[PDB]
């Protein structure tokens, strides 16, 4: 047993590195996150130290699992995004404040996000 303080905080879930990794590239992360079969939204915000431009949103859906990174920060926007139903080419962390309650999902069946495991 160890001592603790009584202090509390009202902040969101995405306030530490708890859902952030950057050496589990799209080919590896789909092997570990793809044994799951939950709603379209069981995501992580990881990247690779291998793709020279990676900042991916990675969804776990109801038939497959896919990654959402292609371009770095631009001068005609911020972090770039272009999915057929998600042209989110601005800073995703600023949009997350709005998406928090009702997210944009993957190319969709369901739209709200929840947090998924990093390991197998």
């Amino acid at each position: 047993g160890s001592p603790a303080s009584g202090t509390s905080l009202s902040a969101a879930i995405h306030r530490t590195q708890l859902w952030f990794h950057g050496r589990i590239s799209r080919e590896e992360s789909q092997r570990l996150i793809g044994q799951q079969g939950l709603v379209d939204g069981l995501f992580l915000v990881r990247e690779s130290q291998r793709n020279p431009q990676g900042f991916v949103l990675s969804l776990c859906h109801l038939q497959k699992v896919k990654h959402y990174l292609i371009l770095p920060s631009e001068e005609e926007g911020r972090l770039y995004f272009s999915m057929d139903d998600g042209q989110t080419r601005f800073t995703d962390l600023l949009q997350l404040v709005e998406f928090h309650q009702l997210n944009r999902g993957i190319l969709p069946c369901l739209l709200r996000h929840c947090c998924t495991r990093v390991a197998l």
Binding site: R26, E27, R31, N51, K66, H67, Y68, I70, S82
Partner: peptide
């Protein structure tokens, strides 16, 4: 493995 990304797969 496949598919890779979205905006594609890259």
């Amino acid at each position: 493995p496949q598919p890779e990304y979205v905006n594609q797969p890259d």
